């Protein structure tokens, strides 16, 4: 029943900013000592940064520091860097005769604010191998852009498509803080071969970019 | 020192998971260990803690279905969870959390997918660059990894020699209930005729690996 209440749930900050993440313990932390801070990057296990409230693990940069007084525990990133994109969690341990419990905070998603970057847009026809098997996947790639928000529309012989595509987006890049996005249009082979012009239109703000191909031409 | 989770993978609803955490480089009875899980896209959830003294303590939500034990002769700690439901799908980690101690040890985690569907290996198709660039000095190419179950697939390029500029997208669940993803990479447009590009797709759940050379069309 021991709980750690973490705030904010997310934040956007620029390279160089000071970031403060806070955790409030629902009770005395074991011996007002058993609080650690963890950092989880996309696809990886959580990595401990700080233990015993304020001890910095030697494999971690000194830009990270922990503090604690009363029920407030705080993680400070003194000069935020692009590689600090991650979700951060506090963890607390509580002991007793018949009690040995851990509570994680809900996590703080740290996003890196950066300058606008226009996507490089690429369109890929279905392979001949896939077409033989009866299905046609058409892929539009939006590479290394910022911010995340972009409207991607498919046109087939100039007819707007609806309901037949799905998108996937990467997490912010640890080096340049950009996103990449795929939109995949899925058609039956029979439907694909009834049309000529395939186009992916990508809109961000005042710019729309359309990349197209003609079926069978190269 | 290392911790390695074993077991897991595809499990049927209504059944049990039996996860083992094997220690290498030290003895398993030297420290207490927690089990922690993380549902896809969600936060960390503590399951239970087995002291170095051998006594098990569980998070309230997990007490009714979970048993945590250790086997010194095998150098393992074990999590058993019965009556699985879809909501139990998660990456399961064994960890010495080190909240107040300088020693922390984590496994890589093991994905448990709670599903009644069967395993299905992927189809792998090229996302081919144009021979004649249409995008300046930088071209894009990739591999479409389609119709597999369960997660995960992993994708490397040129057996790990190519990592710069690679984007392997999160899997998407298709209306078929099968996953698909693409892995793409940007490379010099001038290199196409001279450099070979091979995507290495591993779907361990089906013991299937595909190596696909992606050539200009």
Is residue B154 a contact partner of residue B202, using CB atoms and an 8 Å limit? Answer: yes
Is residue B8 a contact partner of residue B15, using CB atoms and an 8 Å limit? Answer: no
Candidates A168, A199, A213: best to mutate against B (most CBs of B within 10 A) is A168
Which residue, of B114, B136, B152, is where some domain finishes? B114
How far apart CA B202 and CA B209 sit, in angstroms, is 4
Pairing of strands A108-113, A10-14: parallel
Contact A51 B108 (CB under 8 A): no
3-state secondary structure of A132: helix
Tell me, yes or no, whether B80 and B155 share the same domain. no
d(CA A98, nearest CA chain B) in Å: 8
Tell me, yes or no, whether B96 and B38 share the same domain. yes
| Buried/exposed code over A1-31 (b: 16+ C-beta within 10 A; e: otherwise) | ebbbebeeeebebeeeeebbbbbebeeebbe
Compute the Cα dihedral for A53, A56, A57, A63 and give only its sign. positive
Tell me, yes or no, whether B71 and B155 share the same domain. no
B110 contacts: CB under 8 Å, gap ≥ 6:
B5, B6, B7, B8, B9, B19, B91, B92
What are the C-alpha distances in Å from A197 to residues A11, A115, A152, A215, B108?
A: 42, 34, 16, 6, 46
Candidates B99, B123, B147, B170: best to mutate against A (most CBs of A within 10 A) is B99
Compute the Cα dihedral for A61, A64, A65, A71 and give only its sign. negative
- CB neighbours of residue B100 within 10 Å: 20
Into how many domains does chain B fold? 2
Q: Which two tokens stand for residue B213?
A: 């050379």
- CB neighbours of residue B155 within 10 Å: 23
Tell me, yes or no, whether B104 and B139 share the same domain. no
How far apart CA A5 and CA A43 sit, in angstroms, is 25
Is residue A52 a contact partner of residue A33, using CB atoms and an 8 Å limit? Answer: yes
Tell me, yes or no, whether A53 and A129 share the same domain. no
Tell me, yes or no, whether A124 and A93 share the same domain. no
Compute the Cα dihedral for A22, A27, A28, A30 and give only its sign. negative
Peptide bond into B151 cis (omega under 30): no
Domain containing residue A190: 120-214
How far apart CA A138 and CA B125 sit, in angstroms, is 11
Show contacts of A186-192: CB within 8 Å, 24+ apart: A186/A135, A186/A136, A186/A137, A186/A138, A186/B174, A187/A135, A187/A136, A187/A138, A187/A156, A188/A134, A188/A135, A188/A136, A189/A131, A189/A133, A189/A134, A189/A135, A189/A136, A191/A136, A192/A126, A192/A131, A192/A136, A192/A138
Tell me, yes or no, whether A165 and A100 share the same domain. no
DSSP string, A152-208: EEEEETTEEP-SSEEEEEPPPPTTT--EEEEEEEEEEHHHHTT--EEEEEEEETTEE
Tell me the chain B residues in contact with residue A30 when contact means C-beta distances shorter than 8 Å.
99-100
Tell me, yes or no, whether B110 and B127 share the same domain. no
Which residue, of B83, B114, B145, is where some domain finishes? B114
Compute the Cα dihedral for A79, A81, A87, A89 and give only its sign. negative
Domain containing residue B10: 2-114
Pairing of strands B208-213, B198-203: antiparallel
For residue A38, give the DSSP letter: E
Which 3-state string (H, E, C) describes chain B?
CEEEEECCEEECCCCCEEEEEEEECCCHHHCCEEEEEECCCCCEEEEEEECCCCCEEECHHHCCCEEEEEECCCCEEEEEECCCCHHHCEEEEEEECCCCCCCCEECCCEEEEECCCCCECCEEEEECCCCCCCCCCEEEEEEEEEEEECCCCEEEEHHHCECCCEEECCCEECCCCCEEEEEEEEEEHHHCCCCCCEEEEEEHHHCEEEEEECCCC
How far apart CA A149 and CA A14 sit, in angstroms, is 18
Nearest Cα residue to B8 out of B95, B109, B153:
B109
Give the alpha-carbon dihedral of B30, B36, B41, B42, to 10 degrees: -130
Residue with tokens 């046109």: A155
Is residue B65 a contact partner of residue B59, using CB atoms and an 8 Å limit? Answer: no
Element (H, E) at A128: helix A128-132
Tell me, yes or no, whether B149 and B97 share the same domain. no
Which residue, of A54, A86, A113, is where some domain finishes? A113
Into how many domains does chain A fold? 2
Tell me, yes or no, whether A104 and A174 share the same domain. no
How far apart CA B176 and CA B199 sit, in angstroms, is 25
How far apart CA A73 and CA A105 sit, in angstroms, is 11
| Buried/exposed code over A98-129 (b: 16+ C-beta within 10 A; e: otherwise) | eebbbbbbbbbebbbebeebebbbbbbbbbee
A96 contacts: CB under 8 Å, gap ≥ 6:
none
Tell me, yes or no, whether B170 and B91 share the same domain. no
Tell me, yes or no, whether A208 and A133 share the same domain. yes
Burial class (CB in 10 A: 0-12, 13-18, 19+), A76: middle
Tell me, yes or no, whether A45 and A27 share the same domain. yes
Is residue B185 a contact partner of residue B168, using CB atoms and an 8 Å limit? Answer: no
What are the C-alpha distances in Å from B51 to residues A68, A103, B54, B70?
A: 26, 16, 5, 10
Tell me, yes or no, whether A84 and A154 share the same domain. no
Contact B99 A102 (CB under 8 A): yes
Tell me, yes or no, whether B17 and B107 share the same domain. yes
Is residue A130 a contact partner of residue B125, using CB atoms and an 8 Å limit? Answer: yes
Compute the Cα dihedral for A155, A158, A160, A161 and give only its sign. negative
Q: Which two tokens stand for residue A98?
A: 């018949």
Q: Which two tokens stand for residue B185?
A: 């990479």
Tell me, yes or no, whether B63 and B137 share the same domain. no
Tell me, yes or no, whether A96 and A194 share the same domain. no
Which residue, of B82, B114, B146, is where some domain finishes? B114
Tell me, yes or no, whether A46 and A63 share the same domain. yes
The resolution of the experimental structure, rounded to one decimal in Å, is: 1.8
What's the CATH code of the domain at B105?
2.60.40.10
Determination technique for this PDB entry? Answer: X-ray
Q: Is B210 on the interface with A (CB under 8 A)?
A: no
Nearest Cα residue to B217 out of A108, A123, A27:
A123
3-state secondary structure of A48: strand
Nearest Cα residue to B137 out of B191, B186, B187, B189:
B189
Q: What is the largest CA-CA distance in chain A?
A: 75
Candidates B100, B173, B186: best to mutate against A (most CBs of A within 10 A) is B100
Tell me, yes or no, whether A59 and A133 share the same domain. no
- CB neighbours of residue A44 within 10 Å: 12
φ/ψ (deg, to 5) at A26: -75, -10
Nearest Cα residue to A85 out of A41, A22, A144:
A41
Tell me, yes or no, whether A105 and A124 share the same domain. no
3-state secondary structure of A46: coil
Tell me, yes or no, whether B189 and B147 share the same domain. yes
What's the CATH code of the domain at A186?
2.60.40.10
Which residue, of A77, A95, A113, is where some domain finishes? A113
φ/ψ (deg, to 5) at A209: -120, 130
Which of B108, B130, B182 has its CB closest to that of A218? B130
Is residue A13 a contact partner of residue A21, using CB atoms and an 8 Å limit? Answer: no
Tell me, yes or no, whether A195 and A129 share the same domain. yes
What is the side-by-side strand order in the sheet with B2-6? Answer: B2-6, B17-24, B76-81, B66-71
Residue with tokens 């590479």: A143
Is residue A202 a contact partner of residue A192, using CB atoms and an 8 Å limit? Answer: no
Which residue, of A79, A113, A147, is where some domain finishes? A113
Give the alpha-carbon dihedral of B205, A179, B142, A205, to 10 degrees: 130
């Amino acid at each position: 029943d021991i709980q750690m209440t973490q705030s904010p749930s997310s934040l956007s900050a620029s390279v160089g900013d000071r970031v403060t993440i806070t955790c409030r313990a629902s009770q005395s932390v074991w011996r007002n000592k058993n609080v650690a801070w963890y950092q989880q990057k996309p696809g990886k296990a959580p990595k401990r940064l700080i233990y015993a409230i304020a001890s910095l693990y030697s494999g971690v940069p000194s830009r990270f520091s922990g503090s604690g007084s009363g029920t407030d525990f705080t993680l400070t990133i003194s000069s935020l860097q692009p590689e600090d994109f991650a979700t951060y969690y506090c963890v607390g341990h509580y002991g007793s005769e018949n009690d040995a419990y851990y509570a994680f905070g809900q996590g703080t998603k740290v996003e890196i604010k950066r300058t606008v970057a226009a996507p490089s847009v690429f369109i890929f026809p279905p392979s001949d191998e896939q077409l033989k098997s009866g299905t046609a996947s058409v892929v539009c790639l939006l590479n290394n852009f910022y911010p995340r928000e972009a409207k991607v529309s498919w046109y087939v012989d100039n007819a707007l498509q609806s309901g037949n595509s799905q998108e996937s987006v990467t997490e912010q890049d640890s080096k340049d803080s950009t996103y990449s996005l795929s939109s995949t249009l899925t058609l039956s082979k029979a439907d694909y071969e009834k049309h000529k012009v395939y186009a992916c239109e990508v809109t961000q703000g005042t710019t729309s970019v359309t990349k197209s191909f003609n079926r069978g031409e190269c | 020192v290392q911790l390695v989770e074993s077991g897991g993978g595809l499990v049927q609803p209504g059944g049990s998971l039996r996860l083992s955490c094997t220690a290498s480089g030290f003895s398993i009875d030297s420290y207490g260990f927690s089990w922690v899980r993380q549902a896809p896209g969600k936060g960390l959830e503590h399951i239970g803690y087995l002291t170095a003294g051998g006594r098990a303590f569980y998070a309230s939500w997990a007490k009714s279905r979970s048993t945590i034990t250790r086997n010194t002769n095998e150098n393992t700690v074990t999590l058993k969870m019965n009556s699985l439901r879809a909501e139990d799908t998660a990456v399961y980690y064994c960890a010495k959390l080190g909240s107040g101690n300088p020693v922390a040890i984590w496994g890589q985690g093991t994905l448990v997918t709670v599903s009644s569907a069967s395993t299905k290996g992927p189809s792998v198709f090229p996302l081919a660059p144009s021979s004649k660039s249409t995008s300046g000095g930088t071209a894009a190419l990739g591999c479409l990894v389609k119709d597999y179950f369960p997660e995960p697939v992993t994708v490397s390029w040129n057996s790990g020699a190519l990592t710069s500029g690679v984007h392997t997208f999160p899997a998407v669940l298709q209306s078929s209930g099968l996953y698909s993803l693409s892995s793409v990479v940007t490379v010099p447009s001038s290199s196409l005729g001279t450099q070979t590009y091979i995507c290495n797709v591993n779907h361990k759940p089906s013991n299937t690996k595909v190596d696909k050379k992606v050539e200009p069309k």
